[PDB]
Short mmCIF file of N, CA, C and O in Angstrom, two decimals:
data_model
loop_
_atom_site.label_atom_id
_atom_site.label_comp_id
_atom_site.label_asym_id
_atom_site.label_seq_id
_atom_site.Cartn_x
_atom_site.Cartn_y
_atom_site.Cartn_z
N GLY A 1 0.86 -1.22 0.00
CA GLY A 1 0.00 0.00 0.00
C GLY A 1 0.88 1.25 0.00
O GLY A 1 2.00 1.23 0.48
N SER A 2 0.39 2.34 -0.53
CA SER A 2 1.20 3.59 -0.56
C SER A 2 1.32 4.16 0.86
O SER A 2 0.40 4.04 1.65
N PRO A 3 2.45 4.77 1.14
CA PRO A 3 2.66 5.35 2.48
C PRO A 3 1.87 6.65 2.64
O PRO A 3 1.71 7.41 1.71
N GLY A 4 1.37 6.90 3.82
CA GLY A 4 0.58 8.14 4.07
C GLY A 4 0.20 8.20 5.54
O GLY A 4 0.45 7.27 6.29
N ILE A 5 -0.40 9.27 5.99
CA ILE A 5 -0.78 9.36 7.43
C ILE A 5 -1.62 10.62 7.71
O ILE A 5 -1.52 11.61 7.01
N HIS A 6 -2.43 10.57 8.74
CA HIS A 6 -3.31 11.72 9.13
C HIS A 6 -3.94 12.45 7.93
O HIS A 6 -3.29 13.17 7.20
N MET A 7 -5.22 12.27 7.75
CA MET A 7 -5.95 12.95 6.63
C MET A 7 -5.31 12.65 5.27
O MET A 7 -4.55 11.72 5.12
N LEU A 8 -5.64 13.44 4.28
CA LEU A 8 -5.07 13.22 2.92
C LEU A 8 -5.16 14.51 2.09
O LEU A 8 -4.17 14.99 1.58
N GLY A 9 -6.34 15.07 1.95
CA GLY A 9 -6.48 16.32 1.15
C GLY A 9 -7.89 16.42 0.54
O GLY A 9 -8.64 15.46 0.53
N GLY A 10 -8.26 17.58 0.03
CA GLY A 10 -9.62 17.73 -0.58
C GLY A 10 -9.96 19.22 -0.77
O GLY A 10 -9.67 20.05 0.07
N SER A 11 -10.58 19.56 -1.88
CA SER A 11 -10.95 20.99 -2.14
C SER A 11 -12.47 21.10 -2.33
O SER A 11 -13.20 20.17 -2.02
N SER A 12 -12.98 22.22 -2.82
CA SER A 12 -14.47 22.32 -3.00
C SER A 12 -14.92 23.51 -3.80
O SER A 12 -14.20 24.43 -4.11
N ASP A 13 -16.21 23.52 -3.94
CA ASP A 13 -16.93 24.66 -4.50
C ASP A 13 -17.75 25.11 -3.31
O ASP A 13 -18.96 25.24 -3.37
N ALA A 14 -17.08 25.26 -2.18
CA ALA A 14 -17.76 25.61 -0.90
C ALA A 14 -17.33 26.98 -0.38
O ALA A 14 -17.73 27.37 0.70
N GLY A 15 -16.54 27.72 -1.11
CA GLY A 15 -16.12 29.08 -0.64
C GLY A 15 -17.33 29.77 0.00
O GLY A 15 -17.22 30.51 0.95
N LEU A 16 -18.50 29.50 -0.53
CA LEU A 16 -19.75 30.09 0.03
C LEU A 16 -19.83 29.80 1.53
O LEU A 16 -20.40 30.55 2.29
N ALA A 17 -19.26 28.71 1.96
CA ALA A 17 -19.29 28.36 3.41
C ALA A 17 -18.11 29.00 4.13
O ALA A 17 -18.27 29.80 5.03
N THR A 18 -16.91 28.66 3.72
CA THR A 18 -15.70 29.25 4.38
C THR A 18 -15.78 30.78 4.38
O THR A 18 -15.55 31.42 5.39
N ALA A 19 -16.09 31.37 3.26
CA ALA A 19 -16.19 32.85 3.20
C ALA A 19 -17.38 33.33 4.04
O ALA A 19 -17.30 34.34 4.71
N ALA A 20 -18.47 32.61 4.00
CA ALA A 20 -19.66 33.02 4.80
C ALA A 20 -19.27 33.13 6.27
O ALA A 20 -19.49 34.15 6.90
N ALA A 21 -18.68 32.11 6.83
CA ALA A 21 -18.25 32.18 8.26
C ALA A 21 -17.39 33.43 8.47
O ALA A 21 -17.38 34.03 9.52
N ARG A 22 -16.67 33.82 7.44
CA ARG A 22 -15.82 35.04 7.55
C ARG A 22 -16.61 36.28 7.12
O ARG A 22 -16.06 37.36 6.97
N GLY A 23 -17.90 36.14 6.92
CA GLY A 23 -18.73 37.31 6.50
C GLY A 23 -18.33 37.74 5.09
O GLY A 23 -17.92 38.87 4.87
N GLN A 24 -18.43 36.86 4.13
CA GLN A 24 -18.04 37.22 2.74
C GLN A 24 -19.13 36.79 1.74
O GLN A 24 -19.00 35.77 1.09
N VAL A 25 -20.18 37.57 1.59
CA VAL A 25 -21.24 37.19 0.61
C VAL A 25 -20.69 37.32 -0.81
O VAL A 25 -21.09 36.61 -1.71
N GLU A 26 -19.75 38.21 -1.02
CA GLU A 26 -19.17 38.37 -2.38
C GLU A 26 -18.49 37.07 -2.80
O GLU A 26 -18.64 36.61 -3.91
N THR A 27 -17.76 36.45 -1.90
CA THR A 27 -17.09 35.16 -2.24
C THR A 27 -18.16 34.09 -2.39
O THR A 27 -18.11 33.28 -3.30
N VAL A 28 -19.15 34.09 -1.53
CA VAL A 28 -20.24 33.08 -1.66
C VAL A 28 -20.93 33.28 -3.00
O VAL A 28 -21.33 32.34 -3.65
N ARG A 29 -21.03 34.51 -3.44
CA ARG A 29 -21.64 34.77 -4.77
C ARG A 29 -20.68 34.25 -5.85
O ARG A 29 -21.08 33.78 -6.89
N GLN A 30 -19.40 34.35 -5.59
CA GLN A 30 -18.39 33.87 -6.58
C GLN A 30 -18.30 32.34 -6.59
O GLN A 30 -18.42 31.72 -7.63
N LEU A 31 -18.09 31.72 -5.46
CA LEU A 31 -18.01 30.22 -5.43
C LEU A 31 -19.30 29.64 -6.04
O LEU A 31 -19.30 28.53 -6.54
N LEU A 32 -20.39 30.37 -6.00
CA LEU A 32 -21.67 29.84 -6.58
C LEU A 32 -21.88 30.31 -8.02
O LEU A 32 -21.84 29.53 -8.95
N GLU A 33 -22.12 31.59 -8.22
CA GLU A 33 -22.37 32.11 -9.60
C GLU A 33 -21.27 31.66 -10.57
O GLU A 33 -21.44 31.70 -11.77
N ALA A 34 -20.14 31.23 -10.07
CA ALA A 34 -19.04 30.78 -10.98
C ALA A 34 -19.35 29.40 -11.58
O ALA A 34 -18.55 28.84 -12.31
N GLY A 35 -20.50 28.83 -11.28
CA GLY A 35 -20.83 27.50 -11.84
C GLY A 35 -20.35 26.41 -10.88
O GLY A 35 -19.38 25.73 -11.14
N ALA A 36 -21.02 26.25 -9.77
CA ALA A 36 -20.59 25.21 -8.79
C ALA A 36 -21.78 24.36 -8.31
O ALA A 36 -22.85 24.40 -8.88
N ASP A 37 -21.58 23.61 -7.26
CA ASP A 37 -22.68 22.76 -6.71
C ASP A 37 -23.29 23.43 -5.48
O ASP A 37 -22.58 24.01 -4.68
N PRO A 38 -24.59 23.34 -5.36
CA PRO A 38 -25.28 23.97 -4.21
C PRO A 38 -25.05 23.16 -2.92
O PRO A 38 -25.62 23.47 -1.89
N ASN A 39 -24.23 22.14 -2.96
CA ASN A 39 -24.00 21.34 -1.72
C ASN A 39 -22.51 21.06 -1.51
O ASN A 39 -22.12 19.97 -1.14
N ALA A 40 -21.66 22.03 -1.72
CA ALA A 40 -20.20 21.80 -1.50
C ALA A 40 -19.93 21.63 -0.01
O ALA A 40 -19.50 22.54 0.67
N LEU A 41 -20.20 20.46 0.52
CA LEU A 41 -19.99 20.21 1.97
C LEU A 41 -18.60 20.65 2.42
O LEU A 41 -17.68 20.77 1.63
N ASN A 42 -18.43 20.89 3.70
CA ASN A 42 -17.11 21.31 4.23
C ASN A 42 -16.64 20.30 5.28
O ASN A 42 -17.43 19.57 5.84
N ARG A 43 -15.36 20.25 5.55
CA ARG A 43 -14.86 19.28 6.57
C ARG A 43 -15.60 19.45 7.90
O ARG A 43 -15.66 18.55 8.71
N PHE A 44 -16.17 20.61 8.13
CA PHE A 44 -16.91 20.83 9.40
C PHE A 44 -18.28 20.16 9.35
O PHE A 44 -18.98 20.07 10.34
N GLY A 45 -18.69 19.69 8.19
CA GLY A 45 -20.01 19.02 8.07
C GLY A 45 -21.11 19.93 8.63
O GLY A 45 -22.12 19.46 9.11
N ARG A 46 -20.91 21.22 8.57
CA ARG A 46 -21.95 22.15 9.10
C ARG A 46 -22.76 22.75 7.95
O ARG A 46 -23.12 23.90 7.96
N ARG A 47 -23.04 21.96 6.94
CA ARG A 47 -23.83 22.47 5.78
C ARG A 47 -23.21 23.76 5.23
O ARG A 47 -22.24 24.26 5.76
N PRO A 48 -23.79 24.26 4.17
CA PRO A 48 -23.28 25.51 3.55
C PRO A 48 -23.80 26.74 4.30
O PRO A 48 -23.19 27.80 4.25
N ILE A 49 -24.91 26.63 4.98
CA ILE A 49 -25.46 27.81 5.72
C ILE A 49 -25.16 27.69 7.22
O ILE A 49 -24.83 28.67 7.86
N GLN A 50 -25.29 26.52 7.78
CA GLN A 50 -25.03 26.36 9.25
C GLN A 50 -23.65 26.93 9.62
O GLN A 50 -23.39 27.24 10.76
N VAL A 51 -22.77 27.07 8.66
CA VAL A 51 -21.41 27.62 8.96
C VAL A 51 -21.21 28.98 8.29
O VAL A 51 -20.17 29.25 7.71
N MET A 52 -22.18 29.85 8.35
CA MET A 52 -22.02 31.19 7.72
C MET A 52 -21.95 32.28 8.79
O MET A 52 -22.30 33.42 8.56
N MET A 53 -21.50 31.93 9.97
CA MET A 53 -21.40 32.93 11.09
C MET A 53 -22.79 33.38 11.55
O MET A 53 -22.92 34.15 12.48
N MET A 54 -23.84 32.91 10.92
CA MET A 54 -25.23 33.30 11.33
C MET A 54 -25.30 34.81 11.63
O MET A 54 -26.07 35.24 12.46
N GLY A 55 -24.51 35.60 10.96
CA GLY A 55 -24.53 37.07 11.21
C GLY A 55 -24.78 37.83 9.90
O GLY A 55 -24.89 39.04 9.90
N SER A 56 -24.86 37.14 8.79
CA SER A 56 -25.10 37.85 7.50
C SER A 56 -26.19 37.14 6.69
O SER A 56 -25.95 36.15 6.04
N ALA A 57 -27.40 37.65 6.74
CA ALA A 57 -28.51 37.02 5.97
C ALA A 57 -28.17 37.01 4.47
O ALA A 57 -28.61 36.15 3.73
N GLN A 58 -27.38 37.96 4.03
CA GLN A 58 -26.99 38.01 2.59
C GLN A 58 -26.43 36.65 2.15
O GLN A 58 -26.53 36.27 1.00
N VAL A 59 -25.87 35.91 3.06
CA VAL A 59 -25.33 34.56 2.71
C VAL A 59 -26.44 33.51 2.83
O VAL A 59 -26.51 32.58 2.06
N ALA A 60 -27.29 33.67 3.81
CA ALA A 60 -28.40 32.68 4.00
C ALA A 60 -29.30 32.65 2.76
O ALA A 60 -29.75 31.60 2.34
N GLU A 61 -29.58 33.79 2.18
CA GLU A 61 -30.46 33.83 0.98
C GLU A 61 -29.70 33.35 -0.26
O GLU A 61 -30.23 32.65 -1.09
N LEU A 62 -28.46 33.74 -0.39
CA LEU A 62 -27.66 33.32 -1.59
C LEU A 62 -27.76 31.80 -1.83
O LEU A 62 -28.27 31.36 -2.85
N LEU A 63 -27.27 31.01 -0.93
CA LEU A 63 -27.32 29.53 -1.12
C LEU A 63 -28.76 29.01 -1.08
O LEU A 63 -29.12 28.12 -1.82
N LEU A 64 -29.58 29.55 -0.22
CA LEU A 64 -31.00 29.07 -0.13
C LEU A 64 -31.66 29.10 -1.52
O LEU A 64 -31.98 28.07 -2.07
N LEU A 65 -31.86 30.27 -2.07
CA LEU A 65 -32.50 30.35 -3.42
C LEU A 65 -31.76 29.44 -4.41
O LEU A 65 -32.34 28.95 -5.36
N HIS A 66 -30.50 29.21 -4.19
CA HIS A 66 -29.73 28.33 -5.11
C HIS A 66 -30.06 26.86 -4.83
O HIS A 66 -30.68 26.19 -5.64
N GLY A 67 -29.65 26.35 -3.70
CA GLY A 67 -29.95 24.93 -3.37
C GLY A 67 -29.17 24.51 -2.12
O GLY A 67 -28.69 23.40 -2.03
N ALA A 68 -29.06 25.38 -1.15
CA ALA A 68 -28.31 25.02 0.09
C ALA A 68 -28.97 23.82 0.78
O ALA A 68 -29.79 23.14 0.21
N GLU A 69 -28.61 23.57 2.01
CA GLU A 69 -29.21 22.42 2.74
C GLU A 69 -29.90 22.91 4.02
O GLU A 69 -29.38 22.73 5.11
N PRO A 70 -31.04 23.51 3.85
CA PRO A 70 -31.81 24.04 5.01
C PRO A 70 -32.53 22.90 5.73
O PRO A 70 -32.89 23.02 6.88
N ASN A 71 -32.76 21.80 5.06
CA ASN A 71 -33.46 20.66 5.71
C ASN A 71 -32.45 19.65 6.27
O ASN A 71 -32.56 19.22 7.40
N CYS A 72 -31.47 19.28 5.48
CA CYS A 72 -30.45 18.30 5.98
C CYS A 72 -29.76 18.84 7.23
O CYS A 72 -29.97 19.97 7.62
N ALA A 73 -28.94 18.04 7.87
CA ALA A 73 -28.25 18.52 9.10
C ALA A 73 -27.16 17.52 9.51
O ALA A 73 -26.91 16.54 8.84
N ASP A 74 -26.50 17.78 10.61
CA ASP A 74 -25.43 16.85 11.08
C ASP A 74 -26.05 15.60 11.72
O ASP A 74 -26.82 15.71 12.65
N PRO A 75 -25.70 14.45 11.19
CA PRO A 75 -26.25 13.18 11.73
C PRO A 75 -25.57 12.81 13.06
O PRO A 75 -26.04 11.95 13.78
N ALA A 76 -24.48 13.46 13.39
CA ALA A 76 -23.78 13.13 14.67
C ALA A 76 -24.52 13.74 15.86
O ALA A 76 -24.35 13.31 16.99
N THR A 77 -25.33 14.74 15.64
CA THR A 77 -26.07 15.37 16.78
C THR A 77 -27.35 16.04 16.30
O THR A 77 -27.84 16.97 16.91
N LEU A 78 -27.92 15.57 15.21
CA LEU A 78 -29.19 16.18 14.70
C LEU A 78 -29.14 17.71 14.76
O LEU A 78 -30.08 18.35 15.19
N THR A 79 -28.06 18.30 14.34
CA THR A 79 -27.96 19.79 14.38
C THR A 79 -28.40 20.40 13.05
O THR A 79 -27.67 20.38 12.07
N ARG A 80 -29.59 20.95 12.99
CA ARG A 80 -30.09 21.57 11.73
C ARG A 80 -29.60 23.02 11.62
O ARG A 80 -28.93 23.51 12.51
N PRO A 81 -29.96 23.67 10.54
CA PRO A 81 -29.55 25.08 10.34
C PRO A 81 -30.44 26.02 11.16
O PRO A 81 -30.09 27.16 11.40
N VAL A 82 -31.58 25.56 11.59
CA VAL A 82 -32.48 26.44 12.40
C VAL A 82 -31.85 26.73 13.76
O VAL A 82 -31.98 27.81 14.30
N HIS A 83 -31.17 25.77 14.33
CA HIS A 83 -30.53 25.99 15.66
C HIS A 83 -29.38 26.99 15.55
O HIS A 83 -29.19 27.83 16.41
N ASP A 84 -28.62 26.91 14.49
CA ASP A 84 -27.48 27.87 14.32
C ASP A 84 -27.99 29.31 14.35
O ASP A 84 -27.55 30.12 15.14
N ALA A 85 -28.92 29.63 13.49
CA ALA A 85 -29.46 31.02 13.47
C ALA A 85 -30.15 31.33 14.81
O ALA A 85 -30.37 32.48 15.15
N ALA A 86 -30.49 30.32 15.56
CA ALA A 86 -31.16 30.55 16.87
C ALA A 86 -30.13 30.88 17.96
O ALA A 86 -30.32 31.78 18.75
N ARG A 87 -29.05 30.15 18.01
CA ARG A 87 -28.01 30.43 19.05
C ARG A 87 -27.40 31.82 18.82
O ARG A 87 -26.83 32.41 19.72
N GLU A 88 -27.52 32.35 17.63
CA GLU A 88 -26.95 33.70 17.35
C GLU A 88 -28.04 34.76 17.47
O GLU A 88 -27.86 35.78 18.11
N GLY A 89 -29.17 34.53 16.86
CA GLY A 89 -30.28 35.53 16.95
C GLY A 89 -30.52 36.16 15.57
O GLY A 89 -31.19 37.17 15.46
N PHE A 90 -29.98 35.58 14.53
CA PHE A 90 -30.20 36.16 13.17
C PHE A 90 -31.59 35.77 12.66
O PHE A 90 -31.75 34.86 11.88
N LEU A 91 -32.60 36.47 13.10
CA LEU A 91 -33.99 36.16 12.65
C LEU A 91 -34.10 36.30 11.13
O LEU A 91 -34.96 35.71 10.50
N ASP A 92 -33.24 37.08 10.52
CA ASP A 92 -33.31 37.26 9.04
C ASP A 92 -33.08 35.91 8.34
O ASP A 92 -33.87 35.50 7.51
N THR A 93 -32.02 35.23 8.67
CA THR A 93 -31.75 33.90 8.03
C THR A 93 -32.92 32.95 8.28
O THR A 93 -33.26 32.14 7.44
N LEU A 94 -33.53 33.04 9.43
CA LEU A 94 -34.68 32.13 9.73
C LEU A 94 -35.77 32.30 8.67
O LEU A 94 -36.28 31.34 8.13
N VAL A 95 -36.10 33.52 8.35
CA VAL A 95 -37.14 33.76 7.30
C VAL A 95 -36.71 33.08 6.00
O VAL A 95 -37.48 32.39 5.36
N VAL A 96 -35.48 33.27 5.60
CA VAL A 96 -34.98 32.65 4.35
C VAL A 96 -35.29 31.15 4.34
O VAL A 96 -35.92 30.64 3.43
N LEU A 97 -34.86 30.43 5.35
CA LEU A 97 -35.14 28.96 5.41
C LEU A 97 -36.63 28.70 5.17
O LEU A 97 -37.01 28.07 4.21
N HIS A 98 -37.47 29.18 6.05
CA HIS A 98 -38.94 28.96 5.88
C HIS A 98 -39.41 29.60 4.57
O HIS A 98 -40.44 29.24 4.03
N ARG A 99 -38.67 30.56 4.06
CA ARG A 99 -39.08 31.23 2.79
C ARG A 99 -38.75 30.33 1.58
O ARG A 99 -39.14 30.61 0.47
N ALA A 100 -38.03 29.26 1.80
CA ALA A 100 -37.67 28.36 0.68
C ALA A 100 -37.89 26.89 1.09
O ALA A 100 -37.16 26.01 0.67
N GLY A 101 -38.87 26.63 1.91
CA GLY A 101 -39.14 25.23 2.34
C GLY A 101 -38.02 24.77 3.29
O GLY A 101 -37.02 24.24 2.87
N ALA A 102 -38.20 24.98 4.57
CA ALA A 102 -37.15 24.56 5.54
C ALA A 102 -37.74 23.56 6.55
O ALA A 102 -38.92 23.54 6.80
N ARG A 103 -36.90 22.74 7.13
CA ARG A 103 -37.40 21.74 8.12
C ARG A 103 -37.39 22.34 9.53
O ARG A 103 -36.54 22.02 10.34
N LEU A 104 -38.32 23.21 9.82
CA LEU A 104 -38.36 23.83 11.18
C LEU A 104 -39.09 22.91 12.16
O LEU A 104 -40.17 23.21 12.62
N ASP A 105 -38.50 21.79 12.48
CA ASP A 105 -39.15 20.84 13.43
C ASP A 105 -38.15 19.74 13.83
O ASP A 105 -38.48 18.57 13.86
N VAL A 106 -36.94 20.12 14.13
CA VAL A 106 -35.92 19.10 14.52
C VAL A 106 -35.32 19.45 15.88
O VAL A 106 -35.56 20.52 16.42
N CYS A 107 -34.54 18.57 16.45
CA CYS A 107 -33.92 18.86 17.77
C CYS A 107 -32.40 18.78 17.65
O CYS A 107 -31.87 17.88 17.02
N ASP A 108 -31.69 19.71 18.23
CA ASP A 108 -30.20 19.66 18.13
C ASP A 108 -29.68 18.48 18.95
O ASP A 108 -29.13 18.64 20.02
N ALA A 109 -29.86 17.30 18.44
CA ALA A 109 -29.40 16.06 19.15
C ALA A 109 -30.22 15.86 20.42
O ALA A 109 -31.02 14.96 20.53
N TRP A 110 -30.03 16.72 21.39
CA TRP A 110 -30.79 16.60 22.66
C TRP A 110 -31.18 18.00 23.16
O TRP A 110 -31.19 18.26 24.35
N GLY A 111 -31.47 18.89 22.26
CA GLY A 111 -31.84 20.28 22.67
C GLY A 111 -33.34 20.51 22.47
O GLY A 111 -33.78 21.64 22.33
N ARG A 112 -34.13 19.47 22.48
CA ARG A 112 -35.61 19.63 22.30
C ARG A 112 -35.93 20.30 20.96
O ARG A 112 -36.40 19.66 20.04
N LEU A 113 -35.68 21.57 20.84
CA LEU A 113 -35.97 22.28 19.57
C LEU A 113 -35.08 23.53 19.45
O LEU A 113 -34.45 23.93 20.41
N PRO A 114 -35.06 24.10 18.27
CA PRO A 114 -34.24 25.32 18.04
C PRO A 114 -34.85 26.52 18.77
O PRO A 114 -34.15 27.41 19.21
N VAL A 115 -36.15 26.55 18.90
CA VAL A 115 -36.80 27.70 19.61
C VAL A 115 -36.35 27.73 21.07
O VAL A 115 -36.12 28.79 21.63
N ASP A 116 -36.23 26.59 21.69
CA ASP A 116 -35.79 26.56 23.12
C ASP A 116 -34.35 27.06 23.24
O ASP A 116 -34.05 27.92 24.04
N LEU A 117 -33.46 26.52 22.45
CA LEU A 117 -32.03 26.97 22.52
C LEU A 117 -31.94 28.48 22.32
O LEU A 117 -31.04 29.13 22.82
N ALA A 118 -32.86 29.05 21.58
CA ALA A 118 -32.83 30.52 21.35
C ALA A 118 -33.12 31.27 22.65
O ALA A 118 -32.23 31.83 23.27
N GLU A 119 -34.35 31.30 23.07
CA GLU A 119 -34.70 32.02 24.34
C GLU A 119 -33.81 31.55 25.49
O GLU A 119 -33.57 32.28 26.43
N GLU A 120 -33.33 30.34 25.43
CA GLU A 120 -32.46 29.82 26.53
C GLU A 120 -31.22 30.71 26.70
O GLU A 120 -30.90 31.13 27.79
N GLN A 121 -30.52 30.99 25.63
CA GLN A 121 -29.30 31.84 25.74
C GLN A 121 -29.69 33.32 25.86
O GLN A 121 -29.65 33.89 26.93
N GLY A 122 -30.07 33.94 24.78
CA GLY A 122 -30.47 35.37 24.83
C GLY A 122 -31.15 35.77 23.52
O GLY A 122 -31.01 36.88 23.05
N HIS A 123 -31.89 34.87 22.93
CA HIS A 123 -32.59 35.20 21.65
C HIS A 123 -34.09 34.98 21.80
O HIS A 123 -34.63 33.97 21.38
N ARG A 124 -34.78 35.91 22.41
CA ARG A 124 -36.25 35.75 22.59
C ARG A 124 -36.99 36.15 21.31
O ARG A 124 -37.95 35.52 20.91
N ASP A 125 -36.54 37.19 20.65
CA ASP A 125 -37.22 37.63 19.39
C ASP A 125 -37.24 36.49 18.38
O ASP A 125 -38.24 36.24 17.73
N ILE A 126 -36.15 35.78 18.24
CA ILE A 126 -36.12 34.65 17.27
C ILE A 126 -36.86 33.44 17.84
O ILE A 126 -37.55 32.73 17.14
N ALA A 127 -36.72 33.21 19.12
CA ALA A 127 -37.41 32.05 19.75
C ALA A 127 -38.92 32.17 19.55
O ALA A 127 -39.59 31.22 19.20
N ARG A 128 -39.47 33.34 19.76
CA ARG A 128 -40.94 33.53 19.57
C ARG A 128 -41.32 33.25 18.11
O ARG A 128 -42.28 32.57 17.83
N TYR A 129 -40.56 33.77 17.18
CA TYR A 129 -40.87 33.54 15.74
C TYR A 129 -40.72 32.05 15.41
O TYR A 129 -41.47 31.50 14.63
N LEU A 130 -39.75 31.40 16.00
CA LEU A 130 -39.55 29.94 15.72
C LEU A 130 -40.79 29.15 16.14
O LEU A 130 -41.41 28.48 15.34
N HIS A 131 -41.15 29.22 17.40
CA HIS A 131 -42.35 28.47 17.87
C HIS A 131 -43.57 28.80 17.01
O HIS A 131 -44.50 28.03 16.91
N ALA A 132 -43.57 29.94 16.37
CA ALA A 132 -44.73 30.32 15.51
C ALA A 132 -44.52 29.81 14.08
O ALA A 132 -45.42 29.83 13.26
N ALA A 133 -43.33 29.35 13.76
CA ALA A 133 -43.07 28.85 12.38
C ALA A 133 -42.44 27.45 12.42
O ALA A 133 -41.95 26.95 11.43
N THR A 134 -42.44 26.82 13.57
CA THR A 134 -41.84 25.45 13.66
C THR A 134 -42.91 24.43 14.07
O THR A 134 -42.78 23.25 13.81
N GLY A 135 -43.95 24.87 14.72
CA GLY A 135 -45.02 23.93 15.15
C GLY A 135 -44.59 23.21 16.43
O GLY A 135 -43.64 22.46 16.44
N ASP A 136 -45.28 23.44 17.51
CA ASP A 136 -44.91 22.78 18.80
C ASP A 136 -44.79 21.27 18.61
O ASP A 136 -45.82 20.63 18.41
#
């Protein structure tokens, strides 16, 4: 067998994710409008939107209207994209998800629901909107 060790290598059409976490909608527009895949997963397995710093809706809408993964999530802890925007308080990204068919009814592994994790930390404005758009 060929010699090797620890990881190996891999690239993507995911700049939309790496740049998003860094607050870069221009790069997300480039990694996408340049002719790429709407699901360029990242080593963080945090979907293309779950890893956008949840501080710039400009990125949440970019991939959403394209084909991001607002319904899929991390199978290691059932972490959907609704919980990410909830732990931060970006109610804008929340509208985008539900504005393009989103799965607002999952639990972050053992966090009951995204609405609870919101008001739990310091996001009541988003928590109230979630319970009204997630269904008890």
